[PDB]
Design a protein around this ligand. Structure first.
Ligand SMILES: Nc1ncnc2c1ncn2[C@@H]1O[C@H](COP(=O)(O)OP(=O)(O)O)[C@@H](O)[C@H]1O
Ligand SMILES: [Mg+2]
Ligand SMILES: [Mg+2]
Ligand SMILES: [Mg+2]
Lengths: 178, 228, 294, 320, 305, 319, 228
DNA sequence: TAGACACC
DNA sequence: GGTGTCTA
């Protein structure tokens, strides 16, 4: 591009050939299945009783547990996995549910910022800090405190919130609508 | 405003005490470690002409050194910092004051309990040796009619029994015993010569190093003993 | 005393000193007793009834001793956080020579178990400079060797004398802030009907002005529906120990004699296994269905 | 005269920490077994484990070193991650006792779960330098120390004295509390309140000196406070009577009364229900109470869990 | 029969060189000649799953038979750093002459390797024109879905009763020739076909046992517990418990793993309640050795398979 | 004399560490299998694994080397991260010695979980220079050594002797403890206290010499000290007898006696009730005791929780 | 004792062979890699006046370089090391001899099997190139009547078939074939010129580099082959 | 400095 | 989830 009649060179060639590894690294990353699609992929197997394995997959004991608890027919097994579920292999806790719940069919970040924000300013727990968001959003509407306390957003502070570009998106969001 | 090579020298040092700084129009700069264990203050030859908080002071100073000395720092149209060079213009962010830690006021230092001095190359040996011997705490105390500094490695020696290093500052006139313990982590002073002013009232204590360029007050540790 | 800038009444009116707090007879005197010595030992302040404002007493004892005070949300006190900030704080002698006091609020959060054990050697490590004040809803969430280095002080059972006198204190205080905040007093039985409505929890009653009944659940169990129950469960996850008590209490009267023998097996068994159960919110859901059925 | 006052300390359970092994209040054998060590001058690898806090573990560790004039490295066990063991502890075990002083590493509160790897690394390390440097480990819960490590150590276990030893320690602790009051300007009105402290929380000699500090608020001490101290550990009659009457209102109300000490109460209960009930109901009263006791500490609300016991008992207990 | 001399283990030292010398089922053998004739090797994943069938052996020989320039890399070894440096180096580093470049990546189904897998799917888009990839797997699910796209995955195993008959024969005859070079003696020729039967699938397993027995230069694991639970006896279990007291967290993991396959579907739901409850209360339990005994009995009672 | 003395050591379980393979107390076969090795002069790749500490693993490793006049590199297995294996261990397996001394690397306590990669790196490395240098691994838990490694080694497993072997070793250990007392100036009043140490903690010969150090406080083993050794792991007879008699008064009273160490007691109990009771009652005694043990530490009152066990047992146990 | 800048130069080098050292009173210092694969010995101009074991020799040397040259090292009152400066005193720990690996004695080197020499700048190219080509093993062998060194990368080439580097030391008179393999990781000699003495008996082998400042013996790997 | 792995 | 360790 600046050489007209170049050949083709897909995303992957350009990466690997030039040796910037962030593109290669991102080139690897793009191929992998979307987290949300995996979480859906799994829940349906237990349910509709179809094949799949994990360990090729991201697994939240919570998610399956929660998502499952939805149908009162599942609830007995969700319980056992609840009391007992600790220290079972993510893989085991998978196979319990599999041969356990018989039939089938099936059908915060931003707030965390606000909250861990509020507790740090007033030196209080994450418990009142919920009640503090409440007492404001209703009353006083609290963009007005979101105004004083936009002040402390420091870059270091973002890392305790979340681990990714999702954080610097927030950086601005709160520099914004108040 | 413009900043001389001496001022930025000073400022880089303060940056080691605290990553940010709050600069206020006048000829006086000061900072304190976030943890309040070390405080620095200096008069400067340049005049700071506007209030500004800088979040990464080390980064700011690096940029400065990339411009001519005549480069004119001013307040930006939108409020941030504007470094203006002959042909070039740089923009550095002003920080919300509520995000950067500053001392309230310069509290006068109490008249000294003890007074001595430390020579520039002795303070250097102490710092340097300190990384090598792994001396993480030092004690300004009295031995044989002289003021000495004793280094100890507190991880390996809890009581400060085994003395890895000793430096002799000068003879001591008074009759008082004082064992003033300091945390190496808090000796941030830029290299040079320092009047050393020790002060204590009961469990309270502080040491003020008074140099040509600046002053440093630094807290003495809990274990400190004395009859002052 | 006001902090005339701050944005929240409980925060703007927080009693600065130890008298200005609304408390039990035996309790105020015990606390006076402590600050009297001008130096604070290691303390566990434990509730368990909420909104009695543990962290307020604490923030106070520190003020009466004129101590430099580091605050930590208990949720936030993690192993490494104790290793640097606290140790950074705990270690240094203060230029002004007050006592450094670490207040750790609500240390009965969960995986903090390990930071608790790190602290056993610590507390003995800096005794002169430092003390810790732990704030717990349930003591059994403070590990026993920590309980041992600490004064366990255990809050309040207002005497009937306390009751009345506290009550007058809560009216003349609440009166005083509606003053400063320029809010209108239309009736003086509406003030005192707040001081009564939620009594031992004042932090609560002031949070009402800055704007429970088990009925919602009791009603959903009769209706035997899930959507409502499933939703109500996470609401009470917070204090299960309290809620489960209130539940057995009001279901006992409202249900058949044969169902009383069963409601106890169900709730007893559930209560019994809480703390084993991974997800407490779900474990509560499991109770609700079990109950609506039988 | 004798008693050790650190004097840089207000906290008082620590102002009064024993500096030597004699000043230590311990069982007869463990005291001699420690006296034995200090005489020889060379300390073996020891584990001092409670579990219950307050029994003298970390005091004895420091004392053993004092008494031997050891060159001692005291260390927070939680801070011994493996890198710390490889670096500073190794750098120390290895270095050459020159002052001619035996080197001891005291690793305090070393019973953490995830220090398992630092622990496995010590098992080689403890043998390698055993010529030069010995290790004293302090722990509340010994299972958190790996077997290979217990195996390399003499395991002395605190806080389970023989009734004969238990008695002698409670005599010496009382005597101590006295000598401590003397130096703190605390007046002792009744001596009964001082022995009640010693008995009340016995294994633990920290809380024991802790409660005493607590009460000198208006210093000296009276008998009036004695009623504060002993409390009421008597008469199960109210409950025993309500279980016969098989009613709930009474039981429901009595439960929160005893929530405080369940471990004590449940013991007293099985004791007196055993005699007052039928032989067949004895086999059942044990299944019921045993099962209940067993699950206390799992149970969220202890007050309710106690309620659940009472009903269960009124139902199945049949008796005159 | 080929020998790589200077090799210690017979399984390394006798390594069928050509897709012909490999002992294989009907379709499987025809399949690889099918491939070796076209003189070029596509992107492949051979997966067994039952071990010792000859994955890594067919892989290496496919290179041979086409006279490849081969780069042989084991999967535990093919790392975020290796894929970028040597692998890329070889692909883009030029061999003159004929030889075709093929990168045999062995046992690439391994837990932490999934990033090294993605990085290669992209690699394949990058370098495929100038080389070709053969990955080897015990469990294909150890492989990301996208490598299972641009790779032809041929599945080993399951010889027909005809093939069984005729493969046995080849491993028996092939066992004679090893023993001829080795100076090992065959006392009974029915005892050699006792081993070709006993573990039939497993062609790699048969050769380690053979080394074991030549001690006198002639021919004649959770298993211990798994076996004692079937036998439902106590003396054995009671004794095995203290053995594993050491790492319970590891052992209990391995146990649920292998009992899951070996037991009935209804018993799976139960084995989890039993083991889950046990694991759950470890660390409460005073005596961990006994607490483990308590598990074993509980399991022998309720498990059936 | 008849006992090696490291003499730079006060710690005494280590002052007395056997220098050779004969001085080692081991099962009959493993001693001959080790004798066999040292005679030939070239040592194979061995794993010596306990699990239970104190059985001779790291003593035997050092002895094999002594006896062969090996050029030995002793190495803390925890320190073997992969870089150390590529570096210094390779540098050594490769080097040509020349004193004409067989090279042996002893990797002590090599059973760590995360040294898994250093382990995979040895499986190539062990074959490559097996001509030049042999590796002796010591471990408490063998599953922490990868299969491919076990497979490259002779795995000799310590601490499970035959009853015939167990007897001979306890005779030799007693004999040893004696010879060690002789040299330490410890007077032996009753010999019963010395055999009680050997039996009390048997598999482990470290604690066994450790307990002995413990008891010389008064430099005598008199019957007054023999009284001590009986008590710690002592007779469960009083309870075993009260369970047969199925009475409560006795059981109720015996419970608080053993509240102290429940973890030890419950172990001794299951041990002796197993033999003395019916086969059907064995399956039950485990459910009962297992369930009890399992919930100890949840249980408020441990003394009562123990009472609850006793009744439960007297009811369901038959013999 | 006092240590000249040359001695500490040498000592820093030995420190690369083994992290500790055992120094004995006399003019002779020596060390050996813990794994026994490389041995160094040197006569020094300064006289060592007391036996001492040093656990971290690199650390010790760093400290030295922070004092004047006249700084007088002596035995400490309590036995550790005392480095005494004009105004300052440092204390470094003596190590338990049982924790530091030392060679037993200096065994005489057998009369050489082969003798050649290597020039200071050739030894330097070899080392330097070695990092760049990734040559981890070298072979001193015979080709065309000359002694050459051939580098190989043993990870990518197991047999030492492909030769990445070759250096020609000097012609070879004898008729013997010898292929002497050396592990790069074991060439620790300080840069300079070295008489090179190769020696082998059967499977045994070692190479002694003999320099002006010191000597280094280093093991030939098991795969070395010869006619000796 | 992350992610993989392992143990609460 | 937290903490630790190791390899990258
Ligand atoms: N199908 C086979 N034909 C011939 N030899 C085999 C076969 N399978 C395994 N072997 C023996 O095992 C060795 C390695 O086999 P490999 O193919 O790695 O086993 P796996 O199936 O587990 O990958 C070979 O050198 C060979 O002697
Ligand atoms: Mg302690
Ligand atoms: Mg293979
Ligand atoms: Mg060992």
């Amino acid at each position: 591009s600046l050489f007209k009649d170049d050949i083709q060179l897909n995303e992957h060639q350009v990466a690997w050939y030039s040796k910037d590894w962030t593109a290669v690294q991102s080139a690897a990353d793009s191929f992998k299945e979307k987290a949300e699609n995996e979480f859906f992929e799994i829940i349906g197997a237990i349910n509709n009783k179809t094949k799949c394995s994990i360990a090729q997959k991201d697994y939240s004991k919570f998610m399956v547990e929660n998502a499952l608890s939805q149908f009162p027919e599942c609830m007995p097994a969700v319980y056992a996995m609840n009391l007992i579920g600790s220290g079972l292999s993510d893989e085991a806790h998978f196979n319990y549910l599999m041969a356990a719940v018989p039939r089938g069919k099936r059908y915060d970040s931003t707030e965390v910022l606000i909250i861990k924000l509020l507790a740090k300013r007033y030196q209080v727990n994450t418990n009142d800090a919920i009640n503090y968001k409440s007492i404001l959003t209703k009353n006083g509407k609290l963009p007005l405190v979101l105004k004083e306390l936009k002040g402390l957003v420091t870059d270091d502070f973002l890392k305790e919130v979340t681990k990714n570009v999702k954080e610097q998106k927030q950086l601005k969001k709160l520099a914004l609508e108040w | 405003m413009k900043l001389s090579k001496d001022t930025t020298a000073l400022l880089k040092n303060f940056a080691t005490i605290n990553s940010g700084i709050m600069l206020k129009s006048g000829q006086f700069i000061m900072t304190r470690a976030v943890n309040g264990t070390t405080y620095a203050e200096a008069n400067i030859s340049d005049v700071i002409d506007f209030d500004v908080a800088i979040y990464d002071l080390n980064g700011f100073l690096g940029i400065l050194s990339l411009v001519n000395d005549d480069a004119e720092i001013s307040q930006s149209e939108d409020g941030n910092i504007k470094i203006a060079d002959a042909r070039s213009t740089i923009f550095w962010p002003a920080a919300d004051p509520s995000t950067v830690v500053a001392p309230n006021k310069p509290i006068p230092f109490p008249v000294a309990s003890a007074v001595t001095e430390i020579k520039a190359e002795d303070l250097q040996q102490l710092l340097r040796v300190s990384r090598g011997l792994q001396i993480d705490t030092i004690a300004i105390t009295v031995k044989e009619g002289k003021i000495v500094i004793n280094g100890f490695n507190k991880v390996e020696d809890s009581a400060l029994t085994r003395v890895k290093y000793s430096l002799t500052l000068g003879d001591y006139d008074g009759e008082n015993t004082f064992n003033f313990i300091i945390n190496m982590a808090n000796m941030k002073m830029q290299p040079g010569n320092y009047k050393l002013l020790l002060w204590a009232k009961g469990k309270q204590g502080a040491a003020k190093f008074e140099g040509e360029h600046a002053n440093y007050v630094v807290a003495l540790e809990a274990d400190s003993t004395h009859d002052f | 005393t006001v902090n005339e800038k701050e944005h929240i009444l409980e925060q703007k009116y927080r009693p600065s000193t130890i008298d200005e707090c609304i408390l039990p007879a035996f309790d105020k005197e015990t606390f006076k007793s402590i600050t009297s010595k001008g130096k604070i030992p290691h303390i566990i302040l434990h509730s368990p009834s909420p909104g009695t404002g543990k962290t307020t007493v604490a923030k106070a004892l520190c003020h009466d001793v004129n101590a430099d005070m580091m605050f930590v949300n208990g949720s936030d006190c993690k192993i490494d956080f104790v290793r640097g900030p606290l140790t950074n704080f705990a270690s240094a002698a203060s230029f002004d020579g007050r006592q450094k006091v670490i207040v750790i609020d609500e240390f009965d959060r969960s995986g903090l178990a390990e930071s608790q054990r790190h602290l056993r050697s610590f507390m003995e490590a800096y005794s002169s400079n430092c003390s810790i004040i732990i704030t717990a809803n349930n003591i059994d969430g403070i590990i026993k060797p920590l309980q041992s280095r600490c004064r366990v002080i255990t809050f309040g059972q207002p005497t009937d004398e306390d009751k009345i006198e506290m009550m007058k204190q809560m009216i003349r205080r609440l009166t005083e802030i509606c003053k400063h905040e320029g809010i209108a007093i239309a009736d003086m039985k509406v003030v005192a009907a707040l001081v009564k409505k939620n009594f031992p929890d004042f932090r609560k009653t002031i949070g009402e002005l800055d704007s429970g009944a088990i009925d919602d659940v009791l009603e959903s169990l009769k209706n035997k529906d899930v959507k409502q129950l499933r939703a109500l469960a996470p609401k009470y996850a917070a204090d299960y120990s309290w809620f489960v008590g209130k539940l057995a209490e009001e279901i006992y009267s409202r249900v058949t004699p044969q169902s009383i023998i069963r409601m106890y097996e169900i709730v007893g068994e559930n209560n019994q296994y809480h703390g084993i159960a991974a997800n407490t919110e779900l474990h509560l859901a499991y109770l609700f269905i079990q109950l609506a059925c039988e």
